[PDB]
């Protein structure tokens, strides 16, 4: 219906839980490392720590539920506004051909946790295909995030 004060929080609580594989309220280098290793990549022990050290505003070395609600608000400034969309795209376009297919999306799905069924995944891409090409392109992935 309409993004309310709870619908939003629930969304972040899910992402904060996806990383907390165990669910102790603290993302470690191994946990986030497992997620970065499942999507189909290989995080570096040094970069990883430096990555979890960015949101870690406390200086402890672990991310927390509150640090989350406060991390998505510190990147929407300028050093990560239009570059974050191109990254999310890469995840979908693993092959990097210039388009996304329900298959590439199905892969990312199980890589984060939920795995949308088929008809849904098929319709999810059909609604974005403003041109009707059977797949999603870069313009769409952006035209949907630029028009508010």
């Amino acid at each position: 219906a309409d993004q309310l004060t709870e619908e939003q929080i629930a969304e972040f609580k899910e992402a904060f839980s996806l990383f907390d594989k165990d669910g102790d309220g603290t993302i470690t280098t191994k946990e986030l490392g497992t997620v970065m290793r499942s999507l189909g990549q290989n995080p570096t022990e040094a970069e990883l720590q430096d990555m979890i050290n960015e949101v870690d505003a406390d200086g402890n070395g672990t991310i927390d539920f509150p640090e989350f609600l406060t991390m998505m608000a510190r990147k929407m400034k300028d050093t990560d506004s239009e570059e974050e969309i191109r990254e999310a795209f890469r995840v979908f376009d693993k092959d990097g051909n210039g388009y996304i297919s329900a298959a590439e999306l199905r892969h990312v799905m199980t890589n984060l946790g939920e795995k949308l069924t088929d008809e849904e995944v098929d319709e999810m891409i059909r609604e974005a295909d403003i041109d009707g090409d059977g797949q999603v392109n870069y313009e769409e992935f952006v035209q949907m995030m630029t028009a508010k």
Partner: peptide, 26 residues
């Protein structure tokens, strides 16, 4: 060249995994 997906990034693709729609309000 790139340098691994940043933080808000991994949250971008996961947030996309909502239900059957596309695009994030953020």
């Amino acid at each position: 060249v790139k340098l691994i997906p940043s933080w808000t990034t991994v949250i971008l693709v996961k947030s996309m995994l909502r239900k059957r729609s596309f695009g994030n309000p953020f």
